[PDB]
Structure 1
Amino acid sequence: SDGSYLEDQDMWRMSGIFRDVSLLHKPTTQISDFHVATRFNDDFSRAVLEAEVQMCGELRDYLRVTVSLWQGETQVASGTAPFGGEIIDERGGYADRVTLRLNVENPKLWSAEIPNLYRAVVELHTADGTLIEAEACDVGFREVRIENGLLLLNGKPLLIRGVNRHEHHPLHGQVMDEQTMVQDILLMKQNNFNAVRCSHYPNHPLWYTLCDRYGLYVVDEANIETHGMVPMNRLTDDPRWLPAMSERVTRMVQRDRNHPSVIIWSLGNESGHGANHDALYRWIKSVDPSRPVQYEGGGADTTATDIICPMYARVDEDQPFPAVPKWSIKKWLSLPGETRPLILCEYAHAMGNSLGGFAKYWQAFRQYPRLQGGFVWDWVDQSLIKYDENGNPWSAYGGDFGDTPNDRQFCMNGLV
Structure 2
Amino acid sequence: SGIFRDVSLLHKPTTQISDFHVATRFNDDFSRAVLEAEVQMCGELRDYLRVTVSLWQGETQVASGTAPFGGEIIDERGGYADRVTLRLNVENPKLWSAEIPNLYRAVVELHTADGTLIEAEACDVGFREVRIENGLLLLNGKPLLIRGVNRHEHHPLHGQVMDEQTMVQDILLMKQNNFNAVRCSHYPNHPLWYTLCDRYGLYVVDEANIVTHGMVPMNRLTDDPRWLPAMSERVTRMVQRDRNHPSVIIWSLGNESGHGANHDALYRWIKSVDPSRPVQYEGGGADTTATDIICPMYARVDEDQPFPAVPKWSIKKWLSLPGETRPLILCEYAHAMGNSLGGFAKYWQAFRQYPRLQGGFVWDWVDQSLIKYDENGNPWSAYGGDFGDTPNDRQFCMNGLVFADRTPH
TM-score by length of 2: 0.98
Q: Report the Cα distance in structure 1 between the residues aligned to 2:104 and 2:114, rounded to whole angstroms.
A: 28
Cα offsets for 1:13-55 (capped at 9, x unmatched): xx00000110111111011100000010000000000010000
Cα offsets for 1:246-292 (capped at 9, x unmatched): 11000000000000000000000000111000000000000000000
Q: Give SS of 1:88's match.
A: strand
Say if 2:64 is the partner of 1:82.
Answer: no
Q: Report the Cα distance in structure 1 between the residues aligned to 2:8 and 2:378, rounded to whole angstroms.
A: 37
Q: Give SS of 1:246's match.
A: helix
| Structure 2 counterpart of 1:340 | 326
Shift of 1:213: 0.2
Q: Report the Cα distance in structure 2 between the residues aligned to 1:247 and 1:128, rounded to whole angstroms.
A: 39
Q: Give SS of 1:277's match.
A: helix
Aligned residues: 402
Q: Report the Cα distance in structure 2 between the residues aligned to 1:118 and 1:43, rounded to whole angstroms.
A: 20
Q: Report the Cα distance in structure 2 between the residues aligned to 1:305 and 1:268, rounded to whole angstroms.
A: 11
Shift of 1:307: 0.3
Q: Report the Cα distance in structure 2 between the residues aligned to 1:174 and 1:96, rounded to whole angstroms.
A: 39
Say if 2:255 is the partner of 1:269.
Answer: yes
Over the residues paired in the alignment, what is the CA RMSD in angstroms? 0.5
Q: Report the Cα distance in structure 1 between the residues aligned to 2:85 and 2:305, rounded to whole angstroms.
A: 51
Shift of 1:320: 1.0
Q: Report the Cα distance in structure 1 between the residues aligned to 2:193 and 2:113, rounded to whole angstroms.
A: 38
Cα offsets for 1:106-165 (capped at 9, x unmatched): 000000000000000010111210110000000000000000000000000000000000
The runs of at least 4 consecutive aligned structure 1 residues that moved more than 4 Å come to none
| Structure 2 counterpart of 1:6 | none
Q: Report the Cα distance in structure 1 between the residues aligned to 2:396 and 2:266, rounded to whole angstroms.
A: 32
Cα offsets for 1:67-101 (capped at 9, x unmatched): 00000001100010110111011110010100110
Shift of 1:212: 0.2
Q: Report the Cα distance in structure 2 between the residues aligned to 1:340 and 1:307, rounded to whole angstroms.
A: 6
Q: Report the Cα distance in structure 2 between the residues aligned to 1:381 and 1:321, rounded to whole angstroms.
A: 29
Q: Give SS of 2:205's match.
A: strand
Shift of 1:226: 0.5
The one of 176, 192, 197 equivalent to 2:183 is 197
Cα offsets for 1:221-268 (capped at 9, x unmatched): 000011111011110111100100011000000000000000000000
Please list every run of 5 or more consecutive structure 2 residues that lacks an aligned counterpart in the other structure: 403-409
Q: Report the Cα distance in structure 2 between the residues aligned to 1:250 and 1:64, rounded to whole angstroms.
A: 28
| Structure 2 counterpart of 1:180 | 166
The one of 338, 342, 362 equivalent to 2:348 is 362
Q: Report the Cα distance in structure 1 between the residues aligned to 2:10 and 2:202, rounded to whole angstroms.
A: 30
Q: Report the Cα distance in structure 2 between the residues aligned to 1:337 and 1:220, rounded to whole angstroms.
A: 29
Q: Report the Cα distance in structure 2 between the residues aligned to 1:272 and 1:59, rounded to whole angstroms.
A: 46
Say if 2:51 is the partner of 1:51.
Answer: no
Cα offsets for 1:363-411 (capped at 9, x unmatched): 0001000000000000000000001011000000000011111110010
**What's the % identity of the aligned pairs?**
100
Q: Report the Cα distance in structure 2 between the residues aligned to 1:220 and 1:365, rounded to whole angstroms.
A: 23
Q: Report the Cα distance in structure 2 between the residues aligned to 1:284 and 1:379, rounded to whole angstroms.
A: 28
Q: Please give the residue correspondences for 1:203-242 in structure 2 after superposition, counting only pairs within 5 Å.
A: 203-242=189-228
Q: Report the Cα distance in structure 2 between the residues aligned to 1:342 and 1:73, rounded to whole angstroms.
A: 41
Q: Report the Cα distance in structure 1 between the residues aligned to 2:135 and 2:167, rounded to whole angstroms.
A: 34
